[PDB]
Amino acid sequence: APPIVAGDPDFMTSLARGLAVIQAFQERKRHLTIAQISHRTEIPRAAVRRCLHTLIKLGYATTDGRTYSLLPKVLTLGHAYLSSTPLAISAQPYLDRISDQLHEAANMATLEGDDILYIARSATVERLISVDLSVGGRLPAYCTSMGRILLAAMDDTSLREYLERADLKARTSRTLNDPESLFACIQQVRAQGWCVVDQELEQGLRSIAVPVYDASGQVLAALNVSTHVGRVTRSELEQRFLPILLAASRDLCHQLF
């Protein structure tokens, strides 16, 4: 190797704006201007400028005076959640055990808005469109197995509101993407207590998911196992993966509550 050489009065608007400015960077690989951030967030430019100035002084962002980027310190905000949340902490040995036994990826997600949000994953690579899925990433609820678990937990009025507004695009030719077929699908998921999705999010990808409850019988999250097409038989998901996942969900609930 070569050497190394040389009103609500308690709502704090500026905190809200600063977190929205951080969110404006989602999926933007080129540094951003104030104009772009203001456009995306509908926050006035002068406030965006102050937010960025504050983030820079605190080590969360950087600039050349014209454009702006985030710094790695932003990752420590998510680490504050991961290291203070029993659900995320306790689920990791379970996902690791599921994955070691099945030699497939295992995940846990919650609902955030119209998407599922990954909170913990086993140690396997799962690439969507050759990009690793990761803790903190989001996927649409209507076309994922964990999304359908979490939509099934809604009451019918909330579910219909979601289906009349959501972007139901046909991700593959298999995807259920009209409100009547999604509603009937979600009703069966309720009856079953589990959901299989077969290549409705992307070609080649199959997953099976179950709910995780708290002591009150409320759905806190979903657990799943996710696989590629030629890695499984057609009925292995239900016969092989499902009892493992049901048992893990039951064990995690008992451990926490």
Q: Which residues bind Cl ion (CB under 5 A)?
A: 12-14, 31, 43, 67, 69, 71-73, 112, 144-145, 153, 172-173, 195-197, 199, 203, 207, 218-219
What does 60 bind: a second copy, Cl ion, none (CB cut-off 5 to 8 Å by kind)?
Answer: a second copy
Q: Are 106 and 95 in contact (CB under 8 A)?
A: yes
Residue whose CB is less far from Cl ion, 73 or 165: 73
Residue whose CB is less far from Cl ion, 44 or 93: 44
Token digits for 146? 């964990």
Tell me if 181 is assigned to a ligand binding site: no
Q: Indicate if the alpha-carbon torsion angle 152, 154, 156, 161 is positive or negative.
A: negative
Q: Considering the complex, what minimum distance in angstroms separates the CB of residue 173 from a second copy?
A: 28
Q: Are 134 and 75 in contact (CB under 8 A)?
A: no
When asked if residue 194 is in the footprint of a second copy (CB under 8 A), the reply is yes
Q: Which residues contact residue 61 at a Cβ distance below 8 angstroms, ignoring those fewer than 6 apart?
A: 22, 52, 55, 68, 69, 70, 71, 74
DSSP 239: I
Q: Considering the complex, what minimum distance in angstroms separates the CB of residue 52 from a second copy?
A: 9
Go through 106-125 and write b for each residue having 16 or more CB atoms within 10 A of its CB, e for each that does not.
bbbbbbeeebbbbbbbbebe
Residue whose CB is less far from a second copy, 88 or 168: 88
When asked if residue 206 is in the footprint of a second copy (CB under 8 A), the reply is no
Q: Residues 44, 67, 73, 160: which binds a second copy (CB under 8 A)?
A: 73
